[PDB]
Amino acid sequence: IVGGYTCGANTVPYQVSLNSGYHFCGGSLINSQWVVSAAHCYKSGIQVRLGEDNINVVEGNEQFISASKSIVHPSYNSNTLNNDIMLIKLKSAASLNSRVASISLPTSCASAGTQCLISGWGNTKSSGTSYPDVLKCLKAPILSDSSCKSAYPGQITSNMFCAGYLEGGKDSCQGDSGGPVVCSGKLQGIVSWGSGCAQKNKPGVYTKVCNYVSWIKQTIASN
């Protein structure tokens, strides 16, 4: 997250870190046994880390649970990033409390102008590299589809939305991928892609979760 603020420990209780020896992507806990992330975060050998603030220090609220199954969306296209969504089943159920909690799936899609919360452990610089150890947060609005398509001609599908600031300076970034965009207490987006980070006229692009609720629910019910 570029241009954000330190969230505070366990203030984003649905945020998870995906670990394969190191943090490589975010995700969101949607019930005691399932996480949603970006398909472009797929790899084998995932450990899901819940209850994290500092990802390099054991602070006492963590739960570390291995994945038993991963399911990339049937229509994910790695060249265009259309359908950039993946489900991960945990080997055992997490213990839910105030500091580790699920986030609700949306019943309706959010409109442009809605303010959302984006979070992650990704790069904090637009030029160069500095990775934080504690969770960072950013409040940002959903942008109109017209502004999104004007910023990225030929690249925005109906399964994507833009959020952020056209003036630059505030955005998600590498290492935030897979993490949540929460608006009015519902998971509306997944950190997916963008051109650089925090550049003028290049806002972040997010997977539009409301298009996937039926697939998520049916997949969880049968796996």
Among residues 52 and 171, whose Cβ is nearest to Ca ion?
A: 52
Does 174 appear as a known binding residue?
yes
Closest approach of Cβ 4 to Ca ion, in Å? 19
Binding-residue pattern over the window 25 to 64 for Ca ion, x denoting contact by CB under 5 A = ---------------------------x-x----x-----
| φ and ψ of 2, to 5 deg | -100, 130
Among residues 135 and 163, whose Cβ is nearest to Ca ion?
A: 135
Report yes or no: 121 and 191 within 8 Å, Cβ to Cβ: no
Let me know if 133 is a catalytic residue: no
The CB density around residue 13, as the number of other CB atoms within 10 Å, is: 17
Closest approach of Cβ 29 to Ca ion, in Å? 16
Let me know if 98 is a catalytic residue: no
Structure tokens at 21: 């020896």
Does 92 appear as a known binding residue?
no
Q: Which of 138, 205, 202, 133 is nearest to 167 (CA)?
A: 202
Residues 6+ apart with CB under 8 A from 221: none
Give the residue carrying structure tokens 């999104």: 148
Q: Which positions touch Ca ion (CB under 5 A)?
A: 52, 54, 59
- Active-site residues, by number, are 40, 84, 177
